[PDB]
Amino acid sequence: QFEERHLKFLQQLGKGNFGSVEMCRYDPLQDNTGEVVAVKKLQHSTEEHLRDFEREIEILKSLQHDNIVKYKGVCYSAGRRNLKLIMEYLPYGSLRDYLQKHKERIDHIKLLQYTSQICKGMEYLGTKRYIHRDLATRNILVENENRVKIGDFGLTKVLPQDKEYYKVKEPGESPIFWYAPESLTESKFSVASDVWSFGVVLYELFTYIEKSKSPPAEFMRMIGNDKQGQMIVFHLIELLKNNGRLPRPDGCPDEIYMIMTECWNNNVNQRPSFRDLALRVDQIRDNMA
Ligand SMILES: N#CC[C@H](C1CCCC1)n1cc(-c2nc(Nc3ccc(C4CCNCC4)cc3)nc3[nH]ccc23)cn1
């Protein structure tokens, strides 16, 4: 519905592994009346990458929720190459950088607001039987001081109807420090692995993205910085299956840390649901207020 002719490049907004996102201005009248949108593009167009990008586009088109980034349209050439996804432009960027540059104005009540918003978005994803597979603060965008949104779905898969997990291993490497143990060992991805990752997101939020306190830093100072290559993953595996966990972040109440640890249960069936998480987080936020 968008013609590439009229898309005017302004700057680059974010760079991931198979594509990137540009701030551009859709201005068909050529008078700077058009609106500023975000455009996700591909860095290499294989047909594997093209088919997965199309599946992701149709996934995002099927979503509507106040904590999901808004699909706007598609744009292409010549042909059916150069595929580009148009989305609403969120002007405060990723939650990672926003929180790392405003750490002195975001108290625990606002972090709990963000947390409950993420949980509502994730539950909405689950009702459609989608597995996000990449829940992290770098993948959360900020609409304003009171609203955040899940903003990338490049790894999201739909569950088959007879099973509740999804087995997939991608080429290249993976954000293994957000991954549940069953996703490192058997490549199984489900709602419960998304709950593990959300526990990690909670940890991130309450570290305020301190650089020494990142999950990679903490995990590889727990296993030793001498490990390299595949062995890293291996050691991580055993560390997690001996109940080694990320430490409680500085200033984080024990109620929150216990939510985190309950989402890091090794038994994949003893993890909380996103609705139970939203309930507990809302009750804590109400006790603080
Ligand atoms: N999730 C997610 C990650 C995703 C990556 C791209 C490919 C995969 C990972 N990624 C999505 C956006 C993005 N950013 C905005 N706003 C916005 C963004 C950045 C700034 C910076 C602030 C400081 N100064 C320089 C600009 C300001 C405003 N809006 C958006 N809509 C849809 C996406 C999107 C950016 N990276």
The helix (run of H) or strand (run of E) holding residue 73 is strand 71-77
Q: Phi and psi at residue 155, in whole multiples of 5°?
A: -115, 0
Q: Which residues sit opposite 41 in a β-bridge?
A: 20
85, amino acid identity = L
CATH of 95-288, one of 1.10.3720.10, 1.10.510.10, 1.10.599.10, 2.40.50.140: 1.10.510.10
By alpha-carbon position, which residue is closest to atom 18 of ligand 1? 93
How many Å lie between the centroid of ligand 1 and the Cα of residue 159?
27
Residue 13 token pair: 């907004």
Superfamily of segment(s) 4-88: Phosphorylase Kinase; domain 1 (3.30.200.20)
Q: Is 136 in the pocket of ligand 1 (CB under 6 A)?
A: no
Q: Is 121 in the pocket of ligand 1 (CB under 6 A)?
A: no
The answer to whether 78 and 114 have CB atoms below 8 angstroms apart is: no
Q: Is 90 in the pocket of ligand 1 (CB under 6 A)?
A: yes
Q: Which residues sit opposite 37 in a β-bridge?
A: 24, 88
By alpha-carbon position, which residue is closest to atom 23 of ligand 1? 93
By alpha-carbon position, which residue is closest to atom 20 of ligand 1? 93
Q: Is 38 in the pocket of ligand 1 (CB under 6 A)?
A: yes
The helix (run of H) or strand (run of E) holding residue 200 is helix 191-207
The helix (run of H) or strand (run of E) holding residue 254 is helix 254-263
Q: Tell me which residue of 54, 52, 43, 35 sits closest to 16, measured CA to CA.
A: 43
Assess whether the region 4-88 and the region 95-288 belong to the same CATH fold: no
Q: Which residues sit opposite 269 in a β-bridge?
A: none
- Annotated binding site: which residue ranges? 13-21, 40
Residue spans per domain, the chain: 4-88, 95-288
Cα-based distances in Å from 272 to 2, 28, 149, 196, 284? 42, 48, 21, 9, 16
- Annotated binding site for ATP: which residue ranges? 13-21, 40
How many Å lie between the centroid of ligand 1 and the Cα of residue 245?
30
Q: Is 272 in the pocket of ligand 1 (CB under 6 A)?
A: no
By alpha-carbon position, which residue is closest to atom 19 of ligand 1? 93
Q: Tell me how the structure was determined.
A: X-ray
